[PDB]
Each structure stands twice: as C-alpha cells, then as structure tokens.
Design an enzyme around this catalytic site. Sequence first.
Site, PDB file in Angstrom:
ATOM      1  N   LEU A  11      43.900  -4.135  34.390  1.00  0.00           N
ATOM      2  CA  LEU A  11      43.209  -3.509  35.508  1.00  0.00           C
ATOM      3  C   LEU A  11      42.842  -2.059  35.230  1.00  0.00           C
ATOM      4  CD1 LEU A  11      45.262  -5.256  38.271  1.00  0.00           C
ATOM      5  CD2 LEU A  11      42.887  -5.701  37.622  1.00  0.00           C
ATOM      6  N   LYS A  13      43.330   1.289  31.919  1.00  0.00           N
ATOM      7  CA  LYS A  13      43.866   1.769  30.647  1.00  0.00           C
ATOM      8  C   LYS A  13      43.854   3.297  30.538  1.00  0.00           C
ATOM      9  CE  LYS A  13      43.694  -1.322  26.604  1.00  0.00           C
ATOM     10  NZ  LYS A  13      43.452  -1.299  25.119  1.00  0.00           N
ATOM     11  N   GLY A  14      44.637   3.832  29.601  1.00  0.00           N
ATOM     12  CA  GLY A  14      44.710   5.276  29.386  1.00  0.00           C
ATOM     13  C   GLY A  14      45.548   5.671  28.178  1.00  0.00           C
ATOM     14  N   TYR A  16      48.409   7.088  28.074  1.00  0.00           N
ATOM     15  CA  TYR A  16      49.861   6.910  28.248  1.00  0.00           C
ATOM     16  C   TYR A  16      50.400   5.482  28.387  1.00  0.00           C
ATOM     17  CZ  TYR A  16      50.781  11.851  28.116  1.00  0.00           C
ATOM     18  OH  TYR A  16      50.928  13.159  27.680  1.00  0.00           O
ATOM     19  N   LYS A  18      49.222   1.318  30.277  1.00  0.00           N
ATOM     20  CA  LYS A  18      48.250   0.479  30.969  1.00  0.00           C
ATOM     21  C   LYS A  18      48.722   0.075  32.353  1.00  0.00           C
ATOM     22  CE  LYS A  18      46.937  -1.219  26.450  1.00  0.00           C
ATOM     23  NZ  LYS A  18      47.413  -2.153  25.393  1.00  0.00           N
ATOM     24  N   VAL A  19      47.780  -0.352  33.195  1.00  0.00           N
ATOM     25  CA  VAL A  19      48.098  -0.996  34.480  1.00  0.00           C
ATOM     26  C   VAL A  19      47.710  -2.470  34.435  1.00  0.00           C
ATOM     27  CG1 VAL A  19      47.669  -1.050  36.971  1.00  0.00           C
ATOM     28  CG2 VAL A  19      47.730   1.131  35.742  1.00  0.00           C
ATOM     29  N   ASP A 132      44.310  15.898  44.148  1.00  0.00           N
ATOM     30  CA  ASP A 132      43.040  15.310  43.741  1.00  0.00           C
ATOM     31  C   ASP A 132      42.574  14.199  44.669  1.00  0.00           C
ATOM     32  OD1 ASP A 132      40.870  15.327  42.029  1.00  0.00           O
ATOM     33  OD2 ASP A 132      41.902  14.378  40.337  1.00  0.00           O
ATOM     34  N   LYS A 134      39.429  12.885  44.542  1.00  0.00           N
ATOM     35  CA  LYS A 134      38.307  12.127  44.025  1.00  0.00           C
ATOM     36  C   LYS A 134      38.471  10.654  44.413  1.00  0.00           C
ATOM     37  CE  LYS A 134      40.389  12.235  39.364  1.00  0.00           C
ATOM     38  NZ  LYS A 134      40.139  12.659  37.960  1.00  0.00           N
ATOM     39  N   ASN A 137      40.815   8.385  42.609  1.00  0.00           N
ATOM     40  CA  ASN A 137      42.241   8.443  42.907  1.00  0.00           C
ATOM     41  C   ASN A 137      42.671   7.745  44.168  1.00  0.00           C
ATOM     42  OD1 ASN A 137      42.612  10.138  40.703  1.00  0.00           O
ATOM     43  ND2 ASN A 137      44.052  11.433  41.847  1.00  0.00           N
TER      44      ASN A 137
HETATM   45  N1  LIG Z   1      48.552  -0.890  42.164  1.00  0.00           N
HETATM   46  C1  LIG Z   1      47.447  -1.412  41.653  1.00  0.00           C
HETATM   47  O1  LIG Z   1      47.051  -2.495  42.026  1.00  0.00           O
HETATM   48  C2  LIG Z   1      46.645  -0.636  40.647  1.00  0.00           C
HETATM   49  C3  LIG Z   1      45.514  -1.220  40.062  1.00  0.00           C
HETATM   50  C4  LIG Z   1      44.756  -0.488  39.140  1.00  0.00           C
HETATM   51  C5  LIG Z   1      45.108   0.820  38.794  1.00  0.00           C
HETATM   52  C6  LIG Z   1      46.234   1.398  39.387  1.00  0.00           C
HETATM   53  C7  LIG Z   1      46.609   2.697  39.066  1.00  0.00           C
HETATM   54  N2  LIG Z   1      45.875   3.393  38.186  1.00  0.00           N
HETATM   55  C8  LIG Z   1      46.019   4.837  38.098  1.00  0.00           C
HETATM   56  C9  LIG Z   1      44.649   5.513  38.134  1.00  0.00           C
HETATM   57  N3  LIG Z   1      44.388   5.708  39.551  1.00  0.00           N
HETATM   58  C10 LIG Z   1      43.871   4.473  40.133  1.00  0.00           C
HETATM   59  C11 LIG Z   1      42.849   5.334  40.865  1.00  0.00           C
HETATM   60  C12 LIG Z   1      43.106   6.371  39.784  1.00  0.00           C
HETATM   61  C13 LIG Z   1      46.721   5.119  36.822  1.00  0.00           C
HETATM   62  C14 LIG Z   1      47.625   6.177  36.722  1.00  0.00           C
HETATM   63  C15 LIG Z   1      48.275   6.404  35.519  1.00  0.00           C
HETATM   64  C16 LIG Z   1      48.004   5.559  34.441  1.00  0.00           C
HETATM   65 CL1  LIG Z   1      48.803   5.783  32.852  1.00  0.00          CL
HETATM   66  C17 LIG Z   1      47.110   4.514  34.526  1.00  0.00           C
HETATM   67  C18 LIG Z   1      46.904   3.664  33.289  1.00  0.00           C
HETATM   68  F1  LIG Z   1      46.371   4.379  32.325  1.00  0.00           F
HETATM   69  F2  LIG Z   1      46.088   2.635  33.459  1.00  0.00           F
HETATM   70  F3  LIG Z   1      48.097   3.245  32.907  1.00  0.00           F
HETATM   71  C19 LIG Z   1      46.461   4.289  35.730  1.00  0.00           C
HETATM   72  N4  LIG Z   1      47.695   3.233  39.634  1.00  0.00           N
HETATM   73  C20 LIG Z   1      48.409   2.518  40.516  1.00  0.00           C
HETATM   74  N5  LIG Z   1      48.085   1.259  40.852  1.00  0.00           N
HETATM   75  C21 LIG Z   1      47.001   0.672  40.310  1.00  0.00           C
END
Ligand SMILES: NC(=O)c1cccc2c(N[C@H](CN3CCC3)c3ccc(Cl)c(C(F)(F)F)c3)ncnc12
Length: 312
Positions: A11, A13-14, A16, A18-19, A132, A134, A137
């Site tokens: 869902l 990526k980044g 650090y 994944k989600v 933030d 945006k 977020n």
């Molecule tokens: N709970 C969910 O269903 C769900 C579904 C998709 C994304 C997220 C998410 N993503 C955030 C980004 N936010 C979402 C808006 C901006 C996020 C934070 C740190 C990291 Cl390291 C990452 C990663 F890189 F993907 F791991 C993603 N954070 C929390 N729940 C989510």
Amino acid sequence: RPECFELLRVLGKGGYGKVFQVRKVTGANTGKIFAMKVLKKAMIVRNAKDTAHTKAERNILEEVKHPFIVDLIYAFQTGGKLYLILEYLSGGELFMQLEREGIFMEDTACFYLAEISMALGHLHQKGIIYRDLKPENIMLNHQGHVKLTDFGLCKECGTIEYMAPEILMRSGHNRAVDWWSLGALMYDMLTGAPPFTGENRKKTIDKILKCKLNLPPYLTQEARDLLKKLLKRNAASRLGAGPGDAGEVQAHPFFRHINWEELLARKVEPPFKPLLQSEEDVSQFDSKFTRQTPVDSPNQVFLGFEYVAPSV
Ligand SMILES: NC(=O)c1cccc2c(N[C@H](CN3CCC3)c3ccc(Cl)c(C(F)(F)F)c3)ncnc12
C-alpha cells in the site's frame, strides 16, 4: 508476530520500510484485514531524533484512542524490523479523493476540516503536535471518516506547501503551526491549489514567507474569513493560537452547521462513501503500489515495544 499475517498487497513504500495490506490468519480477528507497517530498525537507530520519534509514535498511537486517529491493534518486533498493525483505512488518502474530485464544495470541505479540527484539539491536549496537514498525510477509513496517521518518521520529508512560516524559518514554534496548516489545507480544498507556489521549493518558501493571500470571488464571506484568520503570518494571533485552541476555531461561523457531538460519534454522513466491494478492496489506493507483489525480505533499544489492544 509476522507469521499470523498474510501479505495481500503493498500500500505504501519509503526509505525506512513499507506499509502492507494483510489478512490475519489465526485466532479470532481471523479473516480480518489490517494494514501492516514495517520499519527497518537499522535506519532508525543510527540517528538520535529518529529513534525517539519512532518511539514517540509507538507510545502516542497507544495513549491516544480517538475517532479520528489511526488505531494500533498490534505492535511487535524481530531481528532487525519494527511492526505495527493499524486498522486498514480503505478510504485512502484525502489527497486521492481531492484529485478524483478536483475541487470540493464548501460544505464538503467543512466536513473534513471539522473532523480534523477535533483531532488537533485532542492531540493538543496531550501536548502533541501534528505539523503537517498536507492531504497526503490524511487518510479516510471505510465509512469515509478522516484518520490522522502520521506521527512518526515520515515517508522519505515532502512538499513544504502546507507549512507555517515559523517552521520554515525554524524560529521556534508551537501548537499554532497546525492551524496555519489547516488553513492551507482548506484553501487547497476550495480552490484546487495550495495558497502558495512555487516555481520550485526555494521560491515557494519565499512566497509562504512574503506574499499576500489570494481569495477568489466565488469564496463565501465566512470562508474568506476563516482562511484569513487561519493563514495569519503572526502566530501569536493566528486563530486557534489561544488557550481555547481548537475551540476558538470550531466556533467560527464557517462551522455553524456542525453538530460536534454527532460529528464525534460518526453520525454525520460523509460527503463521499468509499466504494468497497469487499473488506480488502483497494480501489481507493494507487496501483503504482497495489500492482506490485508483496514481499517482506529478512543490543536493540526498543524495549517493551510489543502491544495488544485490550478487549479484542
Ligand atoms: N493504515 C493504513 O491502512 C495505511 C495505508 C497506507 C499507508 C499508511 C501509512 N503511510 C504513511 C504515509 N502517510 C499515509 C498518508 C501519508 C507512512 C508513514 C511512514 C512510512 Cl515508513 C510509510 C512507509 F514508507 F510506507 F512505510 C508510510 N501510514 C499509516 N497507515 C497507512
């Protein structure tokens, strides 16, 4: 631990981690879908603020249960990884809805901004700041209510378009930044564009710091007014910047048709209803991510990180 969860989809990526979208397999909550968030311990511990920050997020998603804030159902660890299991927000990013729709009707914007103004209120009472606003977020849940999700390391740290000047000048700041941000978020909603841009990052900042606001004629007087009290460059006086905080804001004529008690109980019909043909329905996210096959490749400091949501 990791074994209980079948990776259905990527869902996000980044840098650090994944989600993941995953269906739980064993015990009750068997069959139930979640979102799995996985951080590499590696990249977190070599920096100081990063580790505290990851831990803050860990302790905040627990201290804070609230209608408009992503919940933590499990948390846990292994070798070099960090796991959080969040409810899965099939409504996707507010960002996405805004693109699909292009622009919001006022009372549409009003509904989101309202709900959000309540999480800031809640957050601010625990002396927590969100920074933030945006649309990226901000997420929607299945019934399409808002969910604040980002309290930890961010996903890279992204656009600055929604940042108050005091953060961009690093002059020192407080809970007031959120209300600036909320305004910028609002303005974007009602016009399809952030209040300041922005050939590029350098020039955007200059704008955010220097330029006069721009209020289109089709904006209702109340909205013209909120934007102006919320996009105040002088923080001491930016609406919401007072002891009353969220209260000062919620009490603006813009929010006159809001029933805060029903809103909080998720009894106000969301302006848009995620179209889900199933629990795991991901047609609200971005097949940029959903297309890919979900793979989890394989003296720590993360003490009693594990967590289990009480009843259930
Ligand atoms: N709970 C969910 O269903 C769900 C579904 C998709 C994304 C997220 C998410 N993503 C955030 C980004 N936010 C979402 C808006 C901006 C996020 C934070 C740190 C990291 Cl390291 C990452 C990663 F890189 F993907 F791991 C993603 N954070 C929390 N729940 C989510």
